[PDB]
């Protein structure tokens, strides 16, 4: 696709989120980079309302899939870089097993040469001591294949994948997640067959950062199909 | 599961069809046997109204995903099999791209020592002289992942992928398959995680057969998860 | 390669294979056909001799990887066609783990239309009653992951992996391949990055075959590369 | 009983001496890795002064036991069942067109970290080669790392391509033959054949001066489902 073009080279990112959980309102700035010729993302988070009153491996999914590497032979199911620049809806509903639920709506697209991912995030129904408001989840995250179907009728993509995040007693709290992308501009995309993206996240934190924030490594590939 | 014992060895299969395609009825009768053990089914169809007025691939798919082999670290994701003996309940929708639809429902149970599908089969829209009814698809087969998520909230699978059929010029058909399962019985079944069987197809013919018929051979294996 | 062009459809093959194991003496004769776009074989066996003095199963392996389906995305990487027509020397030494070995020379290549594999086999220091003199391996067959390198020096491949055969008592006997090829012509071949072929083997009988004979049904598919 | 050492957080040490077409330098290497996640992170100084090869082509020189064997394959890990008393690695790396590096290591606990401390020797580069003229990108692919038994010597032997990037969009392939023996005298487990995918990012730390880099890797076996 001419989207593709775009992503060639590394790429500055932003993201900003407006969150509301249970009421608890907070705000979370990011910056970094994209190449997605290797899959890879770079991200420093920073909650710049004071404490983050969610775990921060519970927002690592909220917080820009068109950096995928998609190999050679998989390039015409790369949909979200074929929405670019003018850029794509992301919106979910992520369910935390016997918890609350989050729901997030986002626009990712160039704003100028960055790649922006502005989000709204309303978290409702959580446990005052779950795993979630309680801060119970380790500060780490598993490999995860994301699962992507076509959704003609939209113009868009179905996305469906479950998070495991280990939680500080050995046990795992799962995060359901349903997701839609949607291109924002008229210009046609490309709609995928049925495939995967193999995602890895390295988390951790900055020695000379005082306010609480989260490090990300990332590395995402696509994989499943040779047709 | 408690319905994994009833696969560990060879299990006849009797698969009977009754069919409408634009007004076109037919009935096919299939019959063989299904070593889970190995994911390989072996299985033999008869028209027993005369001509098949569809082509034989475009029926594979219609024509058993509790003898697909689930490697031991993915037993737990086995759907199908715990729904045993009692069964499921297989609906689908298959669109075939600029033209017609099959819709399918099939319960799929013991009866006896013997693993039963039973299908009714309609048809409607199709071109005349489109691909299907003008019988221009290649008597073979690709292989196919088949991508399978769970819906507890409608106590099933849903399962979603599309078949390239090959086609006498060099292009392909494609056929999307929209699929549900839903088990008949009251018992405990497995709801997986997302996952999916790779399927390979071999088409033939018995050579001491004189009617309208298909000699099936499957082999069908779980992959994609690893926790 | 050029000698990818010679299986785009349907290829006739003929097997021959001369055998001692211990002395013991026979031949088998085998027929039927390839059509590597599916990765797919169909062939017969007979043993012309009488009855065959080791178990089927343990000369699955020696009985054509020329057929294997290359996905578009790995086709450099097909050492096997890129031979052909004037073929290959397979050479083998299978180590059955607490008995004998066999040792195999093959030549493969077109005489006509017709692809044709003639191998000679010695096996020694078979124990009269072990698992293979005593027959008690089970007519069933596992699927495999076959490992490709490259003999720059030889201008050829190294393969190597290790069948799993399943006994009567419920245990396994491994029989580790170790495997070379080598182009009979002087023309040019292609040497392959490291990646496998998945295999998977369907043994079965005629019913109206009298003769000890062997029908096998495989697939087998390269995979392993993205790059 | 070598996992059990690897169920947390691990401490390393890298050291590396070197001498590529006659220039000698030092590598002190430092961090952690936490197997359960296949996960490395390390940062690795030039103590001599400036690298007289590319960072990358060094990369896998500078702990296979990290890596992630998921819970069905861990029969299989050669690596980990060698520990504490460690498994000594050697290889020879084949630059296509170009030079060679021979390294032997040793890899081993002593005391509570795991310590790879490794000789190099590279032979035969060209001096305006890829290698000795600087002319590898600093980034890095994925590769698939393959594995295979070696029963006689009680150990394995490992095969793989990497593709370093040039700075002109060609690739500088480098062939790695690889060994890997147990130190110690207490059984390891040989595996069946198998493949570890591994993803490598470099980046630099913006307050080191001296010349250095810092790598994160994930490695996960694959391939065994029997």
């Not at 709290?173 to 349903?178: F, G, P, S, W």
């Amino acid at each position: 696709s001419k989207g593709e073009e775009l992503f060639t080279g590394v790429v500055p990112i932003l993201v900003e989120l407006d969150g509301d959980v249970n009421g608890h309102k907070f705000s979370v700035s990011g910056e970094g980079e994209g190449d997605a010729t290797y899959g890879k993302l770079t991200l420093k988070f920073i909650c710049t309302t004071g404490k983050l009153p969610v775990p921060w491996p519970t927002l690592v999914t909220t917080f820009v899939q068109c950096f995928s590497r998609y190999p050679d032979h998989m390039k015409r199911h790369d949909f979200f870089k074929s929405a670019m620049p003018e850029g794509y809806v992301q919106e979910r509903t992520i369910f935390f097993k016997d918890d609350g639920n989050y729901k997030t709506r986002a626009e990712v697209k160039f704003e100028g040469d960055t790649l922006v991912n502005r989000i709204e995030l309303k978290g409702i129904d959580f446990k005052e001591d779950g795993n979630i408001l309680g801060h119970k989840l380790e500060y780490n995250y598993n490999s995860h294949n994301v699962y992507i179907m076509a959704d003609k009728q939209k113009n868009g993509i179905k996305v469906n994948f479950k998070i495991r995040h280990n939680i500080e007693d050995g046990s795992v709290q799962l995060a359901d997640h349903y997701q839609q992308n949607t291109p924002i501009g008229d210009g046609p995309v490309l709609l995928p067959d049925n495939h995967y993206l193999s995602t890895q996240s390295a988390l951790s934190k900055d020695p000379n950062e005082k306010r609480d924030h989260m490090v990300l490594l990332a590395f995402v590939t696509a994989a499943g199909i040779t047709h």
